[PDB]
Amino acid sequence: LWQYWRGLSGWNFYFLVKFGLLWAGYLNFHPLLNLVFAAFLLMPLPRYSLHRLRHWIALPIGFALFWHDTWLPGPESIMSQGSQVAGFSTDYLIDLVTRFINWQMIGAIFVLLVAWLFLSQWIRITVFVVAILLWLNVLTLA
Amino acid sequence: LPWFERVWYALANHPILLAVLAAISVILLAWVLWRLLRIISRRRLN
């Protein structure tokens, strides 16, 4: 089964971003759910097809989980209030978007991406991600 | 004061000026040196 354990690949970056956001105070982090998700991603699958399937399944799940961890209104609230947003002029929407998007945060995420690309070659980032996840869970239980 | 200490006092705070004067002195002593060594080799031809 040793040969079938494949590190969190691109999902390492997903978690790093989450950690960064948690640290910045933008995320309500649910430690156990994220650990379960990580466990799901680390689970040893022998077949290449199962790996593809996992990636496909993991993408929506990861997104959902990320959203859940965010302070963002549920898709239901957006759908019910979305009809009010459709009446906003394009200029207002752009203004809202520019105010909402912190270009500094985007830049940080980018820097993190480059760092991750660079570090993933030297160090097993998965080990750290899992360690931090374990640690965060322990903190929530203590 | 004298004349040798007045020159020293006037130049004491100007290390850049003295370095430029040193560079000029080096160029003048060298170049005349080139010419005069050519002249001594010419006296050798004599």
Partner: protein, 845 residues
């Protein structure tokens, strides 16, 4: 850690891998503790580092290259730290339009000669106008002389605060670095004037501001150092004067009519040397390209040996012996001069093999210049000297004599001050007879004879083309013995026939002769510099009464500017810092005989130097190494007391302790180099091999001819490279064909070794004529020695400093190669620290 515990905790495959590795570590000599720790780290590395990744695979594959100091098979507990340090080093200092900059730098480099050629055209073009009013011109060039000397005097005398002195230093150093990059003789003259200005500023500060008058011990030690520094400054000034404009004299063609060529007597003095040494010089002398009716060769045998008389008769050369062994070589030559009748005399030492071109390359100037009394050529040596041999640096670094013959004598010719060096010279007979022959009053008869010729107003020339080559001294003992004789003789001339006060010499000749005599007095100043920092450490004596920062701000400029200027002028003939090793080895031995000659010049016997001996085993000459070991031990006591003063001494003196300690460490590096030379290396071959590329052929007994290239030759045999598939067998008799001009000569040889296309030939017993022809086809060729001088790489002061630091450690390891005390036991401690030091200075990949 076969411990029941790992068997219980780990799964069988993992356990098996760990045990296998552990055992592997134990097999290679790792302690149990180190092996366990190594396994642990490996596991950790596997956990955190993707060792499967192509990067780590490459690094692992190149592990031996990247981490030479770390043995993967023998883990040490501090290995991780070592890896970190090395990695940090590799990450940082480890590297060995912007691209256009490189090409354009070379473009400007190529332009340098082109622009230089244009400048020389302009040099003549400006001269094609350089004329006006001579009295005034003298005033105006003389007007330049007075204003520029006033500016130089202000630059020398100006008192500065530490900050202004630092700014001034950095600006002058910046100017020196810019000027050093400029090609040609003019930039060398600017660097001389700049070096002299900075060195005069140093000596001015020393004389005016740095003597402690209130402490008698500091005053006496400070005056002893000031004497050594004043001597070093005088030799620097006179050295620059002597080499300021090397003449590079070219040969003058002889008349086409050989009836106008003068008569020449060749003298080969011998005392006690073996006939096999003298044979080669005589056989080469017979091959000189001169009319036979105008060439006379003389064996001057001071031993009166019948084998030499019979040899002379068999070869058709003149023989003379004498019954009185008075004045050695000088007396032997002066006896021969009574019977010789040639208009010129040429002198070769009995081991110096002349080239056929020797008289053609030298004689043309004696016809051009009627007042020319002497022409000297370089002494070249085809055997290593003891420095070259013991350091394993033969033909890699210029040997001690290369500075003197390569530059100093060519500098002397500019001043009409070239002096006879005992061999490889032509002397006009009439001027030599007018002075009473070769001088006999001093143990350097050669330099003293030249002084007498110059006092009569005759001239001397230097031809910087090797036209003969001889044998070097075979031991450091014989070498030191020869240098003691020369040092004594030069100081005897300074006392008996003083160049400064005696009549007849031109002012420039006086300065050149004084510098040549002063050079041999360097032993006392060198011993002072090796002991000066110990005066503060051991006696609390302030040898330089100034703040340590001011010492650095005055000494460092002087040393840097002198070194940069010497590297630019001398760098082909002497690498930086190598002079200090040569002078330090000689310093102890030349100091007593020169001091005795200065007080009483008549106290001196001539010793003969042995040549032609074998060194069968490597040995340390403990008699010769004693002074170096004493100076090393004395400097190490300095280090121990300096460490004690740094921790228990006054805080105000801490910087003075550090400056003195840096100087003691420098002295220990130089002394380590002197110790490294004192380890005699094994001389396996009687016959020295002369590397030379020449076309040849080999004929087998079946008549088949094969083209070959001679790679090396010696008196007993040759190394050849065969061109093509020659089936040559070991022990086979083969005829070697060599060419001399249009004539081909056949030499019987035996194949001694075959290594693919490289064949070692041994000469069979030659007839007298074949032996003459062999020497004339090899040692006496016109091109043999001329090509060897231009082969030395240009000096790089930082690379030469690293080479000496490696040599000193090697010399430390040489005092460890042999020590009569724990000195070596210290080196045992020294090398544990230096395994740590292989870890330190990042190993250049």
């Amino acid at each position: 850690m076969g411990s029941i515990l790992t068997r219980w905790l780990l799964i069988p495959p993992v356990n098996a891998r760990l045990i296998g590795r552990y055992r592997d570590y134990r097999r290679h000599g790792a302690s149990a503790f180190s092996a366990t720790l190594g396994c642990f780290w490996m596991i950790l590395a596997w956990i955190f580092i993707p060792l499967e990744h192509p990067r780590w695979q490459r690094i692992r594959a190149e592990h031996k290259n990247l981490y030479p100091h770390i043995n993967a098979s023998r883990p040490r507990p501090l290995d991780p730290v070592r890896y970190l340090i090395q990695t940090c080093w590799l990450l940082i200092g480890a590297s060995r339009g912007l691209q256009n900059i490189r090409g354009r730098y070379h473009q400007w480099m190529n332009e340098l000669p082109e622009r230089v050629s244009h400048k020389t055209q302009h040099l003549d073009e400006k001269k094609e106008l350089g004329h006006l009013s001579a009295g005034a011109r003298r005033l105006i060039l003389g007007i330049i002389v007075t204003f520029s000397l006033i500016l130089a005097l202000i630059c020398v005398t100006q008192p500065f605060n530490p900050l202004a002195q630092f700014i001034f230093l950095m600006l002058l150093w910046g100017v020196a670095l810019i000027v050093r990059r400029m090609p040609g003789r003019f930039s060398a003259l600017m660097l001389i004037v700049l070096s002299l200005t900075v060195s005069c500023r140093y000596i001015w500060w020393r004389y005016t501001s740095t003597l402690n008058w209130d402490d008698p011990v500091s005053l006496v030690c400070g005056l002893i150092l000031l004497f050594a520094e004043t001597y070093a400054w005088i030799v620097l000034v006179l050295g620059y004067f002597q080499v300021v404009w090397p003449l590079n004299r070219q040969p003058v063609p002889l008349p086409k009519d050989m009836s106008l060529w003068p008569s020449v007597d060749i003298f080969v003095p011998t005392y006690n040397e073996d006939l096999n040494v003298v044979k080669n010089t005589i056989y080469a002398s017979l091959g000189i390209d001169w009319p036979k009716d105008k060439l006379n060769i003389w064996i001057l045998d001071d031993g009166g040996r019948e084998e030499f008389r019979q040899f002379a008769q068999n070869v058709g050369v003149k023989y003379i012996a004498r019954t009185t062994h008075e004045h050695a070589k000088a007396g032997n030559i002066n006896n021969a001069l009574k019977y010789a009748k040639g208009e010129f005399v040429s002198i070769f030492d009995c081991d110096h093999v002349p080239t056929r071109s020797f008289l053609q390359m030298t004689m043309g100037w004696f016809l051009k210049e009627k007042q020319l009394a002497m022409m000297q050529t370089p002494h070249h040596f085809f055997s290593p000297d003891p420095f070259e041999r013991n350091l394993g640096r033969f033909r890699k670094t210029p040997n001690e004599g290369t500075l003197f013959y390569g530059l100093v004598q060519d500098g002397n010719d500019m001043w009409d001050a070239t002096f006879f060096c005992g061999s490889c010279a032509v002397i006009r007979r009439k001027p030599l007879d007018e002075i009473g022959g070769i001088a006999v009053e001093t143990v350097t008869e050669d330099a003293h004879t030249s002084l007498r010729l110059h006092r009569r107003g005759y001239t001397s020339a230097y031809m910087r083309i090797p036209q003969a080559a001889g044998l070097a001294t075979e031991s450091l003992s014989a070498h030191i013995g020869q240098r003691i004789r020369w040092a004594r003789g030069m100081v005897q001339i300074f006392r008996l026939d003083n160049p400064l006060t005696g009549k007849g010499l031109k002012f420039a000749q006086r300065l050149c002769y004084v510098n040549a005599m002063f050079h041999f007095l360097s032993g006392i100043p060198r011993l002072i510099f090796l002991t000066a920092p110990l005066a503060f450490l051991l006696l609390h004596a302030y040898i330089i009464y100034a703040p340590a920062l001011m010492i650095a701000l005055f000494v460092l400029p002087h040393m840097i500017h002198a070194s940069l200027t010497n590297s630019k002028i001398q760098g082909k003939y002497r690498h930086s810092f190598w002079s200090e090793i040569y002078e330090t080895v000689l310093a102890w031995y030349i100091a007593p005989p020169t001091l005795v000659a200065l007080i009483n010049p008549h106290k001196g016997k001539f010793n003969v130097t042995a040549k032609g001996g074998l060194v069968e085993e490597e040995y340390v000459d403990w008699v010769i190494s004693r002074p170096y070991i004493f100076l090393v031990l004395l400097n190490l006591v300095g280090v121990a007391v300096g460490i004690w003063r740094y921790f228990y001494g006054p805080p105000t003196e801490m910087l003075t302790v550090v400056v003195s300690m840096v100087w003691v460490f420098y002295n220990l590096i130089v002394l380590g180099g002197a110790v490294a030379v004192s380890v005699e290396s094994k001389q396996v071959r009687r016959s020295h091999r002369v590397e030379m590329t020449m076309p040849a052929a080999i004929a087998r007994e079946d008549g088949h001819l094969f083209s070959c290239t001679v790679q090396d030759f010696s008196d007993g045999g040759l190394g050849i490279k065969i061109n093509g598939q020659a089936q040559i067998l070991e022990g086979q008799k083969v005829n070697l064909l060599l060419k001399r001009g249009q004539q081909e000569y056949v030499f019987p040889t035996q194949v001694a070794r075959v290594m693919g296309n490289e064949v070692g030939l041994k000469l069979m017993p030659l007839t007298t004529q074949q032996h003459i022809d062999f020497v004339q086809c090899t040692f006496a060729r016109a091109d043999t020695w001329a090509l060897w001088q231009d082969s030395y790489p240009e000096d790089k002061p930082l690379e030469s400093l690293l080479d000496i630091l490696k040599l000193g450690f090697r010399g430390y390891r040489h005092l460890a190669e042999f020590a009569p005390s724990s000195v070596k036991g210290i080196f045992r401690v020294l090398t544990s620290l230096v395994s740590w030091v292989v870890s330190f200075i990042p190993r250049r990949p």
